[PDB]
Amino acid sequence: DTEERLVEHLLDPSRYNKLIRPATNGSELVTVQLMVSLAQLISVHEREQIMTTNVWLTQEWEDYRLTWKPEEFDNMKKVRLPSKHIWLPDVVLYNNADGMYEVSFYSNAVVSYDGSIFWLPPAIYKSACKIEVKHFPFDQQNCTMKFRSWTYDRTEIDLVLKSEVASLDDFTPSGEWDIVALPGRRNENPDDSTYVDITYDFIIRRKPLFYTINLIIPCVLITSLAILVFYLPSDCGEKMTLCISVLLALTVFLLLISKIVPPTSLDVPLVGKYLMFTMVLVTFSIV
Amino acid sequence: DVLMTQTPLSLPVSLGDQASISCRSSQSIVHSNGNTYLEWYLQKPGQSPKLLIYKVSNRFSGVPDRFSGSGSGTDFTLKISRVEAEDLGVYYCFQGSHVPWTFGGGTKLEIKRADAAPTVSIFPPSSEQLTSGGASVVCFLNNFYPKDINVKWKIDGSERQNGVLNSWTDQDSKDSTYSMSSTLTLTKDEYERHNSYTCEATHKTSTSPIVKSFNRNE
Amino acid sequence: VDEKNQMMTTNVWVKQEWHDYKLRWDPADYENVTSIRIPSELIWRPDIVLYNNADGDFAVTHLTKAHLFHDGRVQWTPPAIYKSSCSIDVTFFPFDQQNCTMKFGSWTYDKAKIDLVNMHSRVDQLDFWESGEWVIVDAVGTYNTRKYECCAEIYPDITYAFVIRRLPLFYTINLIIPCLLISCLTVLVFYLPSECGEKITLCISVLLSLTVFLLLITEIIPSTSLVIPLIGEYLLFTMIF
Amino acid sequence: ETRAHAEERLLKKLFSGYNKWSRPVANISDVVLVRFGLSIAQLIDVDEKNQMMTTNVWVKQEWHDYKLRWDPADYENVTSIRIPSELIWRPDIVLYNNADGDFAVTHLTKAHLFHDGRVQWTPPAIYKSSCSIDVTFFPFDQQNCTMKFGSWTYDKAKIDLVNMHSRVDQLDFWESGEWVIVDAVGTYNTRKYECCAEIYPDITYAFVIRRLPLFYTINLIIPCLLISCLTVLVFYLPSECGEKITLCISVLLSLTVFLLLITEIIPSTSLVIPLIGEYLLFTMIF
Amino acid sequence: VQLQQSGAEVMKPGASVKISCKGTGYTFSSYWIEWVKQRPGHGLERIGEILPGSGSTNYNEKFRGKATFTADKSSKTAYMQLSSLTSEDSAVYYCARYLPYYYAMDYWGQGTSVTVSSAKTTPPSVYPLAPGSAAQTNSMVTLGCLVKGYFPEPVTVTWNSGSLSSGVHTFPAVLQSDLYTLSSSVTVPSSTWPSETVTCNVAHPASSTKVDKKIVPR
Ligand SMILES: *[C@@H]1O[C@H](CO)[C@@H](O[C@@H]2O[C@H](CO)[C@@H](O[C@@H]3O[C@H](CO)[C@@H](O)[C@H](O)[C@@H]3O)[C@H](O)[C@H]2NC(C)=O)[C@H](O)[C@H]1NC(C)=O
Ligand SMILES: *[C@@H]1O[C@H](CO)[C@@H](O)[C@H](O)[C@H]1NC(C)=O
Ligand SMILES: *[C@@H]1O[C@H](CO)[C@@H](O)[C@H](O)[C@H]1NC(C)=O
Ligand SMILES: CN1CCC[C@H]1c1cccnc1
Ligand SMILES: CN1CCC[C@H]1c1cccnc1
Ligand code: NA
């Protein structure tokens, strides 16, 4: 019964407003503490350079006008409130593709009596990270993701990390991909003096057995025949069929491994370079 | 696995002297990003290892400036400006390039000063051990430097090597010397058949081996 | 059930029933009316979210209507489309069983406020549509409690485990029988005499044929390095030989 | 005495009798100045077969009116407050070269406000332009793709566009990896359409870019240029061995499959032909 | 931050030993925990690291099949099941936090001593070390207090309440057949020994043994 009166007292548009942000004592900064938690890395499309992950981001901030006298309202400590109505500092990706920027669910927020608010919505994020494809597949991928308020600079809000490492208490084994470390760092730009943001760096390692058994064994299996075609006796007249078939198979594997690799012209996959070199060798063989 | 080779093994240097220690890798340990991830560890006797250098081109937050680190892509060198009483211990290398990770071999580091005269003393068994039925001859060699010293046991002029227990401690702090104990355990029945028992010590600071002998029947 | 991406797309009718004190009235005073139907946007709604989503909805955004009885009971039946991400275990392909879990639960309420009770021990199947390829062997519901890093209280959850089987006839009539049939030639070439001169043709043709079949089967099964598909092992075995 | 309480009174006062659809100008004859600028977050993709360039663009629009002015020394020294762009007038800047994309700024970001009446607005957007892909020297190619921004329902008498920066800013550019921007030029122009009598302004942004050639010269042209060195090789083979037709048919089917493969990556443009396609047809004839 | 480990552990050869690692003051399940093995002789060799969140484990190629880590998310505790243990792995085990490619190894554990030997319980011992019969009386003389046959470590062999603390020598433990044998020595002026009462005391907390025995000349 008293909860309804308490909520109507707090969320009255005549008294509380949404479009303005709280502050005291001559435009003091309202510190916002955000930390991330990786639920499970659900997919990494390397061809499109898109890492789709599940994220729980927790945000804490102090707010003064939402307080109340705890003794009056039957000694209530914390109250749930909808996210749409109370003010919330925007915290959104920048390098995000697919257009989608903000969070998905807009969950309820817990408000204490002192004024501290603690809010965490779920989210699915589609980060865009460059694919360092050099040691395929024995590679380490370095995907960066940025958090920064697209609406506020470092004149009203300031972002500070709570924990130096992303939490993994809710992590589940992804299968193909394996995490190594999850460092987060608060960047600073002295030239602009307003650009402030948080970068989390996911360093990921691919488990090698799948692609190994699938591609590497047939590759070396069929390329071990390039140096073998010569041992065939020439009177039989069968060098041509074997050698042309080997060259055709090498071209097919080259096209396939080029279609699976992300089309980045900055570096060369080592397997592709090896195959091109042995293809030149086998055409010198056929001539 | 990328093995690590530290040079030297033991480098005694006096208080205030500059000491440089090299640490080489069997392979190249430079990461493709362009940063070499190597750690220097300091272990003191009876305590957990401490940190002094991480990311060699950088310095740890909490260690004084007297330490420095440098090197090329493969050869690495840790340098100390002035050795203090606190810097005693063992250094260790740590590479962070390839999986799995590995440590070094361990570089011993203590202080150095002049030589000293070794104090040798032999102790025959007591009456309580004779009541028990054993014979423990203990030969102490204390306050000597350096560690180049040999202890030999003679029974009636014959060399004896079975039952010899040789123990030594680290360099003490207040006198900067070494110690070494040689224990010889035998039965009481063998103690009544031999005549002369001798502990001899050969050290650099003595042209003649220090002899300490004792007879059973006098 | 997209196993290449490890996503199960299901169509789910959710049934949520409860009761509160404010919405009670007297039927005998209003010409004997008992149940009225109202849009769910106007009344309170508990937040039921699934944790195991991947590129889909987190909620019941359709916002169906809801019934109301005279004593305060309220019943709410929204339909939705859920996209779970379950670990596909493919070892005995295609004779495979899949075990996929969906985790439902409250979000902003502890066990001290909202407590979930499973209405049915088993998932109802009265209006099930037989897809043809997958048949549901069983669907079990479990009530559990956990304790997360955020908070001090414990949070309840309901885990629904679907254990299902794949109908094997299609892949055993179009995928494994061709390769098992053309794998019987790797020993045949030795009986072919060398004077005629076509054994290398047969050998290289068989080798490229198994290569094509392997690079085909590498598309239908997921790219998961935890275990190996048995058919893949057999194909690599025959390619080595 | 708190800052929020004063900003609330300010926001209540100025939005009391303010209209959205009224073009805010002192007199009818007076004009406005919309300073316009672009920034590229990243270059997503250039699908040449469909003739579509997908870009992620920050649009910077600055202007000012007379109704949203006040005095800062009266409201506890407040100068810049932020308000949702749905409540204030929003000039409609549309691109004419759309192809299955967004014509507008549907994200509806927030907008700043200064004390003198200046207003700044920065909505992110995803644009999909359609530019004439000129593929002749494949892959050593330069692409010249244009976008045509401009007002829609206002003439030059009411709105006059002024390019803020002579060049497109690239301080936050994300390297796609395959495409690097050589240069980007923005040109102010005026046209006259069949509808009306007045002339309408616009700004044409032309991107001249190059394709990084290493990825295709290591997987596409080198295998075909290698296997084409066999068409003259077959004649030197003696006739009695009996496998020259095998080599010939192998080369022909291989290069034909190659050629039919290359038609999936270049557009189906009939104005010009790729040099690689001409070379492959030449080799097939011979 | 703070780390805790298990106490001292002893067991017959061939069985299994499980040690615990407790961590507090940080996000326990967010980055790697690696353990360091230190043989009492020399060198530092690793045993492996694990990520308490996922089931990602790795091992050094030398210690495969010897240890198996295990992690718990509810209770911030890491365990290690041990395979068939032999007399060559009796060493000290550590635990430490590590995060690859970035800031790493800023804190440690305190150490866990595990000893594996065929023994049950042996009290420490008394056998004084008296000087030789034929010896030249000098200005100073060395003393001796010997202890044989005790298990396990540690023991405290001191003089009379620290009265004679300058010039003491405590050696490391060395086996003879199956147990430990140590000695304590100190140099005292010869003008005081025939007058002052001196007695070496032995204290063993693990067996609650407080025994002294006066040394008298011959
Ligand atoms: C994954 O990619 C990220 C982003 O490129 C890498 O972060 C970068 O790391 C380097 C080396 O640590 C940083 O350079 C350093 O910058 C500081 C100050 O600018 C300077 O004191 C150092 O001497 C050094 O130059 C660089 O700032 C940083 N990039 C950022 C924060 O944007 C990260 O290293 C990559 N992961 C791995 C394992 O390499
Ligand atoms: C399916 O997985 C769940 C959760 O792991 C488990 O409880 C259940 O036993 C499994 N079902 C079968 C048939 O293995
Ligand atoms: C790109 O096209 C525009 C418009 O056709 C043209 O004006 C410009 O010259 C072209 N760019 C270059 C570098 O030729
Ligand atoms: C209990 N929920 C499950 C995960 C997050 C946690 C939570 C805590 C406080 C407010 N909302 C959600
Ligand atoms: C000037 N606009 C450009 C194309 C259509 C024309 C127009 C004319 C009148 C009203 N709206 C748009
Ligand atoms: Na053929």
Explain what you see.
Chain D: Belongs to the ligand-gated ion channel (TC 1.A.9) family. Acetylcholine receptor (TC 1.A.9.1) subfamily. Alpha-4/CHRNA4 sub-subfamily. Chain D: It is found in: Synaptic cell membrane; Cell membrane. Chain D: This is Neuronal acetylcholine receptor subunit alpha-4. This is part of a larger assembly, with 1 copy of chain A (287 residues), 1 copy of chain B (218 residues), 2 copies of chain C and 1 copy of chain E (218 residues). Chain A has a single domain (1-207), classed as Neurotransmitter-gated ion-channel ligand-binding domain (Acetylcholine Binding Protein, Chain: A), CATH 2.70.170.10. Chain A has 4 helices and 12 strands. Chain A has 287 residues and is an alpha+beta fold. With 218 residues, chain B is mostly beta strands. Chain B folds into 2 domains: 1-113, Immunoglobulin-like (Sandwich); 115-214, Immunoglobulin-like (Sandwich), CATH 2.60.40. In chain B, strands 3, 4, 7, 8 and 9 form a 5-stranded antiparallel beta sheet that branches. Chain B is elongated, with a radius of gyration of 24 Å. Chain E has strands at 2-5, 9-10, 19-24, 32-38, 45-50, 57-58, 67-71, 77-82, 92-93, 96-98, 112-115, 127-128, 140-142, 145-150, 156-158, 169-170, 174-175, 180-185, 187-189, 199-204, 209-214. The termini of chain E are far apart. Chain E folds into 2 domains: 1-118, no CATH class; 119-217, Immunoglobulins (Immunoglobulin-like). Chains in contact: A-C, A-D, A-E, B-E. At the B-E interface, strand 8, strand 10, helix 1, strand 11 and strand 14 of B face strand 12, strand 16 and strand 18 of E. The site of one 2-acetamido-2-deoxy-beta-D-glucopyranose has 3 residues of chain D, from strand 11.
Largest sheet of chain A: 7 strands, mixed
Measured between the Cα atoms of the first and last residue of chain E, the distance is 59 Å
Helix content of chain E: under 10%
Task: Characterize the quaternary organization of these chains.
Answer: part of a larger assembly
Number-wise, the strands of chain A total 12
Gross CATH architecture of chain A: Distorted Sandwich
CATH topology description of chain A: Acetylcholine Binding Protein, Chain: A
Report the total helices of chain E: 0
Lipidation (S-palmitoyl cysteine) (chain D): 241
GO cellular component, one term (chain D): plasma membrane
Protein name (chain D): Neuronal acetylcholine receptor subunit alpha-4
Disulfide bonds (chain D): 131-145, 195-196
Key traits:
part of a larger assembly, 5 chains, A: 287 residues, alpha+beta, Acetylcholine Binding Protein, Chain: A, 7-stranded mixed sheet, 5-stranded antiparallel sheet, 22% helix, 29% strand, elongated, C: 241 residues, 4-stranded antiparallel sheet, 4 helices, 27% strand, binds a molecule of 3 linked components (NAG-NAG-BMA), binds 2-acetamido-2-deoxy-beta-D-glucopyranose, binds (S)-3-(1-methylpyrrolidin-2-yl)pyridine, binds sodium ion, Neuronal acetylcholine receptor subunit alpha-4 (chain D), ion channel (chain A), membrane (chain A)
